[PDB]
Amino acid sequence: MLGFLSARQTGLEDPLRLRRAESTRRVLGLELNKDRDVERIHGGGINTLDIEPVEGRYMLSGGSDGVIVLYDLENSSRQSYYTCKAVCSIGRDHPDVHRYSVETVQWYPHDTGMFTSSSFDKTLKVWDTNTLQTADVFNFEETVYSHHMSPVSTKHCLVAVGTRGPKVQLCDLKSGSCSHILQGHRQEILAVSWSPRYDYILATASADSRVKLWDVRRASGCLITLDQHNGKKSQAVESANTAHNGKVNGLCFTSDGLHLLTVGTDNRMRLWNSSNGENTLVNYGKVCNNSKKGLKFTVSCGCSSEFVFVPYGSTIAVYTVYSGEQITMLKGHYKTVDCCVFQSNFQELYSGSRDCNILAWVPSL
Amino acid sequence: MQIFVKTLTGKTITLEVEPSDTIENVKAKIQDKEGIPPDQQRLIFAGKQLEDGRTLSDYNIQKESTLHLVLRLRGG
Amino acid sequence: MLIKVKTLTGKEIEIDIEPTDKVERIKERVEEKEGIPPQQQRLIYSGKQMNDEKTAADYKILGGSVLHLVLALRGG
Amino acid sequence: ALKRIHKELNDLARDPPAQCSAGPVGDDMFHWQATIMGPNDSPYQGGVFFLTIHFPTDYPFKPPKVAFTTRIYHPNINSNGSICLDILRSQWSPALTISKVLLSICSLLCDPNPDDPLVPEIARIYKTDREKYNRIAREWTQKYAM
């Protein structure tokens, strides 16, 4: 690596080159760390994690027992080994704790002061990071598998909420109105996601093997309805254009926002184009999943070749997004993995499982 | 001499015992004191089962000591 | 405040400390009244092994808050 | 209920059990951490094994999920640190309080039952040769408990 240092020193290669090459090297050498720990606080499994977007310091986690821990990943100690102490926690003793499993906790974008969560108690609560008090609560008529806030929108603050009804809900964290709904799906909505690039493009995955991108400004259906064979087996859109063969329960736009990775219960990933819904035929091999709710997964940022970290049974699988190769298989858990989140700042990966653990993977050397 | 035992209900009761006395009579004293059957007690001293066929002097028990009472359990 | 540092045997050693004493002070006080030098203690308060640099106010130690003392024979 | 846990916490702070200690880890009173000092005259002598209690939302009428954090050598406790007491799964009784479940676990550290064991690999060693058991447990205690 001294070659990269000298090249950067004499201005040959842009500093970008060393930065990205070193980030890729670190992610390729990713391994579990016994030189770091995250305190065990959840009675049941961990369903979700979301490192804060700005400064990458705090870290929420939605336990399956309704407790929302709020970790602190900065090594405030002096020793090489440390444990990420849990700063706060919405314990069961809290008056407004979630009665059932918390399956999505997300920071309010552009404002770390607040964060949101939602649970099978058919509620979505807007939590205040400082005083830990519900700022706003929206009660739905049915459960809430997954919700997501636009990480790019400075204009609106709508919140797609995929209930187990066929209708996507849009909740407004400004003056409350959950009236706006997006009709067109046929079964439960297991995973939604806003477009990181465009303000108003929402991609919603369902359990009927359909992935649709909605222009929420448009109030006459969806822009696109993803189709496996790119229209080869052309059929009108009444029972066709199925992005999978079984339930599709996970979405993750690539970091640039140009491609919409989807993973479904048919045991395949597919890197769909995000502008016209044309499958790009990246193989990815066979990816194992059997979960019956929102499967979380994330994609690396600031690396030469974009990696995707998909929960694969009880192991994290690391694929290269644009080539489909399998980099490795991080292997440290005791039950199925429910959510892995990438710490972009230092190329660290935190993967909550169903065994109440949150294993923090870090690079070697 | 006497001995302290901490019953299950939070209360504490004092048992008048002698070192020669066997644990079976100790459990019978617990019974007629409050009435949980000889089988269901499991007396604990320093994290040790007090075996039925033994006496206090076996376990190195003296005055003003304390015995802990729990509900009968088993392995797994 | 008073902390009573009760060991395994049940002996309940009394101690006195100001609300801001560093736990090394607590171990030293235990040395005077009990005789075990601070290297061989492992004070356990309410299921948290106290760390030798934390101040007593960190753990919310109040009057009559019983600690636990366990011997670490090696103790460096 | 909280009030039950509050009363347990207060009556434990006042009159603690001898070789046990449990208190909340943070703000959430439903998540305690406990500590079972190894009973005397046992391979676990001088040990300090940390548990991790989790009280359900109906704690009086439903057991707490206690699980060892310090890897303990025991036929009845798996390497993951999970216990399989009958009192804690099937025969839970509200009258039994946390000061009592911890003490019962402490007693069972010395009184395993290799019949119907959670770890048959260690159960066979215990049933056949108890001399080796008291050495492997001793080394595990020395390498985890101290």
The contacts of residue A182 (CB under 8 Å, 6+ apart) are A167, A168, A170, A202, A204, A214, A216, A222
Residue A92 to residue D27, Cβ atoms within 8 A: no
Domain span including residue B68: 1-76
**DSSP classification of residue C58:** G
What residues pair up with A300 in beta bridges, in sequence order? none
CATH number at residue C38: 3.10.20.90
> What CA–CA distance (Å, rounded) separates C38 from C56?
16
Return the structure tokens found at A157.
């603050």
Half-sphere exposure of residue A164: CA atoms within 13 angstroms, side-chain side: 13
Option in C6, C8, C46 nearest D23 (CB): C46
Q: Do at least 3 CB pairs under 8 Å connect B with D?
A: yes
Q: Where are the domains of chain A?
A: 1-365
Experimental method: cryo-EM
CATH number at residue D136: 3.10.110.10
Which of residues 3 through 62 in chain B touch D, CB cutoff 8 A?
A: 8-10, 42, 44, 46-49
Helices D120-128 and D130-144 pack at an angle, to 10 degrees, of 130
* Alpha helices per DSSP H over chain A: 2-9, 15-28
> What CA–CA distance (Å, rounded) separates A307 from C11?
61
Total count of domains within chain C: 1
Q: Which residue of C has its CA nearest to D9?
A: C46
CB A200 within 8 A of CB A219: no
Other beta carbons within 10 Å of D8: 21
Would an 8 Å CB–CB cutoff place D23 in contact with chain C?
yes
**Which residues in D lie closer than 8 A to residue A43 (C-beta atoms)?**
31, 54, 56, 65
CB A125 within 8 A of CB A117: yes
Total count of domains within chain D: 1
Sign of the Cα pseudo-torsion (D115, A356, A27, A314, in order): positive
Q: HEC states along D37-57?
A: ECCCCCCCCCCEEECCCCCCC
Residue B65 to residue C10, Cβ atoms within 8 A: yes
> What CA–CA distance (Å, rounded) separates D38 from A221?
66
> What CA–CA distance (Å, rounded) separates D65 from D80?
13
> What CA–CA distance (Å, rounded) separates B22 from A142?
63
Amino acid residing at A332: G
Half-sphere exposure of residue C41: CA atoms within 13 angstroms, side-chain side: 28
CB D33 within 8 A of CB C23: no
Chain B nearest C-alpha distance from C70 (Å): 14
Nearest C-alpha neighbor of A225 from the set A211, A239, A204, A246? A211
Q: For residue C4, is it left (φ>0), alpha (ψ between -120 and 50) or beta?
A: beta
The Cα angle at residue A81 between residues A77 and A85, in degrees rounded to 5: 55
Burial class of residue B62, CB neighbours in 10 A (0-12, 13-18, 19+): exposed
Which of residues 12 through 71 in chain C touch D, CB cutoff 8 A?
A: 42, 44-49, 64-66, 68, 70-71
Domain span including residue D97: 1-146
Task: Respond yes or no: is residue D106 known to be catalytic.
Answer: no
Chain A nearest C-alpha distance from D1 (Å): 9
Domain span including residue C65: 1-74
> What CA–CA distance (Å, rounded) separates A47 from A60?
11
